[PDB]
Scaffold this motif. Sequence first.
Motif, PDB file in Angstrom:
ATOM      1  N   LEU A   1      28.104  14.809  99.025  1.00  0.00           N
ATOM      2  CA  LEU A   1      27.983  14.496  97.666  1.00  0.00           C
ATOM      3  C   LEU A   1      27.946  12.868  97.536  1.00  0.00           C
ATOM      4  N   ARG A   2      27.973  12.387  98.193  1.00  0.00           N
ATOM      5  CA  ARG A   2      27.618  11.202  98.420  1.00  0.00           C
ATOM      6  C   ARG A   2      26.451  10.714  98.868  1.00  0.00           C
ATOM      7  N   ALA A   3      25.684  11.331  99.847  1.00  0.00           N
ATOM      8  CA  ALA A   3      24.634  11.211 100.267  1.00  0.00           C
ATOM      9  C   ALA A   3      23.351  12.029  98.760  1.00  0.00           C
ATOM     10  N   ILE A   4      23.656  13.198  98.134  1.00  0.00           N
ATOM     11  CA  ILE A   4      22.875  13.600  97.777  1.00  0.00           C
ATOM     12  C   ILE A   4      22.704  13.104  96.440  1.00  0.00           C
ATOM     13  N   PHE A   5      23.983  12.590  95.443  1.00  0.00           N
ATOM     14  CA  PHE A   5      24.076  11.872  94.397  1.00  0.00           C
ATOM     15  C   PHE A   5      24.300  10.858  94.739  1.00  0.00           C
ATOM     16  N   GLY A   6      24.391   9.714  93.245  1.00  0.00           N
ATOM     17  CA  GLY A   6      24.591   8.634  93.140  1.00  0.00           C
ATOM     18  C   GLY A   6      25.423   8.268  93.502  1.00  0.00           C
ATOM     19  N   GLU A   7      26.884   8.358  93.404  1.00  0.00           N
ATOM     20  CA  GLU A   7      27.947   8.821  92.945  1.00  0.00           C
ATOM     21  C   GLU A   7      28.522   7.706  93.792  1.00  0.00           C
ATOM     22  N   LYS A   8      28.739   6.993  93.956  1.00  0.00           N
ATOM     23  CA  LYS A   8      28.947   5.726  94.953  1.00  0.00           C
ATOM     24  C   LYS A   8      30.651   4.981  94.264  1.00  0.00           C
ATOM     25  N   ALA A   9      31.360   5.639  94.885  1.00  0.00           N
ATOM     26  CA  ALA A   9      33.174   5.258  95.287  1.00  0.00           C
ATOM     27  C   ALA A   9      32.911   4.597  95.824  1.00  0.00           C
ATOM     28  N   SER A  10      32.741   2.689  95.037  1.00  0.00           N
ATOM     29  CA  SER A  10      33.357   1.686  95.933  1.00  0.00           C
ATOM     30  C   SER A  10      34.656   1.771  95.902  1.00  0.00           C
ATOM     31  N   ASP A  11      35.209   0.586  96.364  1.00  0.00           N
ATOM     32  CA  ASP A  11      36.806  -0.151  96.901  1.00  0.00           C
ATOM     33  C   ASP A  11      37.381   0.007  96.003  1.00  0.00           C
ATOM     34  N   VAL A  12      37.008  -0.340  94.495  1.00  0.00           N
ATOM     35  CA  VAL A  12      37.747  -0.422  93.523  1.00  0.00           C
ATOM     36  C   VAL A  12      38.064   1.269  93.133  1.00  0.00           C
ATOM     37  N   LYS A  13      39.733   1.555  92.576  1.00  0.00           N
ATOM     38  CA  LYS A  13      40.261   2.027  92.818  1.00  0.00           C
ATOM     39  C   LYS A  13      40.619   2.602  91.020  1.00  0.00           C
ATOM     40  N   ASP A  14      40.392   3.248  90.779  1.00  0.00           N
ATOM     41  CA  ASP A  14      41.162   4.183  89.089  1.00  0.00           C
ATOM     42  C   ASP A  14      43.490   3.765  89.439  1.00  0.00           C
ATOM     43  N   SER A  15      43.255   3.318  89.543  1.00  0.00           N
ATOM     44  CA  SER A  15      45.388   2.892  89.349  1.00  0.00           C
ATOM     45  C   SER A  15      45.704   2.444  88.326  1.00  0.00           C
ATOM     46  N   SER A  16      44.963   2.675  86.939  1.00  0.00           N
ATOM     47  CA  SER A  16      45.466   1.537  85.492  1.00  0.00           C
ATOM     48  C   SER A  16      46.343   2.080  85.517  1.00  0.00           C
ATOM     49  N   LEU A  17      47.647   2.261  84.629  1.00  0.00           N
ATOM     50  CA  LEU A  17      49.110   2.279  84.118  1.00  0.00           C
ATOM     51  C   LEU A  17      48.245   3.110  82.725  1.00  0.00           C
ATOM     52  N   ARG A  18      48.275   4.497  82.714  1.00  0.00           N
ATOM     53  CA  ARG A  18      47.521   4.642  81.209  1.00  0.00           C
ATOM     54  C   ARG A  18      48.920   4.855  80.285  1.00  0.00           C
TER      55      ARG A  18
END
Lengths: 195, 76, 227, 303, 249, 78
Positions: free
Chosen positions: E206-223
């Motif tokens: 999926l990362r090879a097909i599209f431009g979805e490049k999830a880097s070292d940033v992680k969605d860990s914000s306290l909602r």
Amino acid sequence: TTIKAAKKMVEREEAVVWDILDEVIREHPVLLNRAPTLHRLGIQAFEPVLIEGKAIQLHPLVCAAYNADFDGDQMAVHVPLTLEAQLEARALMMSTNNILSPANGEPIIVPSQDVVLGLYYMTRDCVNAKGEGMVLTGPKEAERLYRSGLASLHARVKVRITEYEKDANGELVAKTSLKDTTVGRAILWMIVPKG
Amino acid sequence: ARVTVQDAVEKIGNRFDLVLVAARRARQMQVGGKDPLVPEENDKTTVIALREIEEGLINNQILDVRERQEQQEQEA
Amino acid sequence: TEFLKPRLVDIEQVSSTHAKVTLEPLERGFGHTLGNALRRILLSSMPGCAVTEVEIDGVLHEYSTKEGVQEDILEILLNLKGLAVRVQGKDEVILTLNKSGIGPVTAADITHDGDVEIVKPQHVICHLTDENASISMRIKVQRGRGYVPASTRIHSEEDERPIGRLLVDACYSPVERIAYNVEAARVEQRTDLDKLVIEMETNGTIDPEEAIRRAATILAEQLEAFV
Amino acid sequence: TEFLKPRLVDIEQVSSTHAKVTLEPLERGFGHTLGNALRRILLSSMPGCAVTEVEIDGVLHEYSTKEGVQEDILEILLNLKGLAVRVQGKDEVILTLNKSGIGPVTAADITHDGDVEIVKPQHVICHLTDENASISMRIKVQRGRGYVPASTRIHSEEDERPIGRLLVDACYSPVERIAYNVEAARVEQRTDLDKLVIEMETNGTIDPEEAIRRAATILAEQLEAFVDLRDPILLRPVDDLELTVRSANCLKAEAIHYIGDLVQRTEVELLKTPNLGKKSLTEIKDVLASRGLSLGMRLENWP
Amino acid sequence: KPLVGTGMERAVAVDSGVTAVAKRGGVVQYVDASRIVIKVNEDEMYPGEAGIDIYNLTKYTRSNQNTCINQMPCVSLGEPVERGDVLADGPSTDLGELALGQNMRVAFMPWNGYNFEDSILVSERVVQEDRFTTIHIQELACVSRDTKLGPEEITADIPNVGEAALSKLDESGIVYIGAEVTGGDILVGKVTPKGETQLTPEEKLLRAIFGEKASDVKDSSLRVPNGVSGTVIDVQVFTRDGVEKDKRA
Amino acid sequence: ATTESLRAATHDVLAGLTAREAKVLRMRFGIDMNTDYTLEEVGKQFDVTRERIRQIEAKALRKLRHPSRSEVLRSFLD
Ligand SMILES: [Mg+2]
């Protein structure tokens, strides 16, 4: 389309997810459970409906089987997942499957305090009895002259009540006669079945 | 069979084998691809299996010969 | 200014005159309002025709028994009180019962007029016990409104009546027991709306879903000069 | 004795708040039914004017303080909802209120237009205790029905509104307590007819002559249901067929911009097109049949 | 106002300490929503003071039970208040009397079985008039601890989220003062630098097909916890020494 | 959920690839295989020149990046 698109539809509260929750919530029993339970009837299954609020509307007839008066009791609601546990919830531990208690033959899912007070006010008789002298045709005229306001709930009159008894092997017989009773007993007899 | 299963338990005989063959019928209805003998009228497969139980069409040996016919059809 | 109207009705008719009419959806709290505003106008302010007096000519009390009958006079008076009859031309229409021999006196052995149309002739009235035990009474059908009991007219009628004139409990409206329960039905965004399940069992001479429209146009005539 | 219709015969006014309206004549059953029906439908479902959104300058949230105001601004929103305005013409209005000097901030100094009318100008709102720090806010009056809280309006409105717009519980019902009594009417031909006086204790933002005519209108609309009743495939580009580029790159030369211009193409023109003679035309027919279309399908006014 | 009382209500507020207590009595000079200035009279005046006792009233702070504490001023402007009396009622008081709740019409009768086993059946006017509505101030400390794989930055660019969820945020990711947040939204954008976890081959495709490049940033914000609506009243920011501050802090 | 539903989606979509591009792409990343291989290791089985496997991978990318039939694969970006 996918799982996370449905999750974003859940997190943003779409209009259609309430309809699909009403579709999936019907014919799907769920287990209500008081903590801590007192006996076997302190936890049983229930077929839930969808309302507003943030609490569970419990049926009042089974709160005596819970022995859980409305004191803010933290009830756990457990979901049976597979069809084995779903049919086990629907056909065996639903409240429609057990009208008696496992402790004694008397029903602990009996009409409790408020509804037994309403029924005792229904079956009460008077001496003044402002609907005096009118002979009631049955349960129909009894509830009619109670709801119209011209007659009270307390009237020692004669009511033609149709009653049935299965004296044979399940065969009910039809008979109607006059009995010395009140109007509210006939209005309860409207809710009482044939047998 | 939404509000009453007493007719089912008096035509079958007990609760446990009834709910076991009803869950077997519902498992054959969910992913087995079988057609229901009861009309749906916007209901899930569990109460449809219970309505097939209380109609006298689904039992233990009836489901046994029903899966045996499908096994003999598949292995032919 | 929206004034949301219901969409689905789905009338469920159990018997010939047990048309349970549902209504979904309504606004927040219109369910009890529309269930009580239609029930009590069927109870107290619905016009119709039924029996008011009787002229049995030989029974002058409600508890004094007679001869040639099976049950008491109160039971045949109660059977006369429940009668599916409706007249068209006149209002105070008088009928006559005629039954001789030995047999159950049903609702077919009575003299009907041209404006009298019996809908339910299977209503049993009396039973002739003895052989050639004849009985006769006059059926006085008067058009009334809702219900009037015997106790509200037995105090006003002070004038002297002949031997046989008794007071029948007149069921002046042609509807039977009317009841309703307000179930909470939802729309795709709101749940404070409510369904109105009107369970109405009815006697003859009127259809229940037609009695719904009759009560609706009566209450609309009660609010016609307010728009 | 067949039918009888009532009429609004007297509209009594004790004050601007109290109003003892009566209905005459009614029958024995019509006296209690019309009193119970018209009390309930006028209590909740009455179209009135309430306070929904208030943006006070200088503050940011509804639990914030201000200089020289003597009270929390959350208390000001509790008296704005108890403040009656008679917005006749428009359905919504942005009412502005400015007040300077030491003194109570009443409703008589509201900078209002002509279509609205403050019926209670002596209603207490705030108490300004500083001449230098004045008080100023906007009031978004909305014409609604019933009662909606602040959490319900934000669930049905997912727009981008700026901060400071404090949501107020819109108590759209203007009435407070409604009574009705069933007495005997004064009719010379039939004494048994019943009169019905409706004690309407409300605020001045609703005309009691119009309150009966509005409550009887809504009940007539509910009885109206009682007495009467009971191509996205052709609007597509070329490249979304996942066609092989042996013939897809050559059909762009003459005319290709939509998928509707490809089903109108003929076989003799594709024969003259290079690399579209015999074999790839069957592949074009196959990929058209994969979407349900075919070669030579005529469109009826596609663009 | 507490209708049915006991006589203890006139002393519990003055003895509790959460109200504005009258240490020196005098005449009211100036009353604000956040402070009360009473002018001390001559009999209770000290030569070593200024004759003015300003009471800095505590605003909406957090209690230990996630509810509000607000010292609302109740006295009017220009009235004498003697020694030992009340100037500002606290969170559950009214004019020096203990305002524990509200008073309204109660009927001891059954209505459709709703009051079945000692349960409450309310009208609409308990929330139409906002009588039983309640402020509840909670705390949610978005903590940026320092792990081995980089310290937790507080920024605004968060992946796997929409722009409408980040519409009420600044370039630092914190909500503005007065932002009416809903249950499920992000109140503070606090992402963590995650380690390079080994991906499944389907997500690698999926990362090879599209431009979805999830880097070292992680969605860990306290909602925001779901079901909890409401606004914000204060955003307290604290930091370690030697650490620079962004524009929001 | 997604760690198996995306695998089922690739097993449904790449089965429509009726040539050896799916067979060299399933071992390009490790789908339904044990050891992840580079272009050289998949070359020695089929196509020893690396740029042939690279060109067929770019052709499969140009087939799959269009929002026409891989929209169910496009929805898995979250
Ligand atoms: Mg307890």
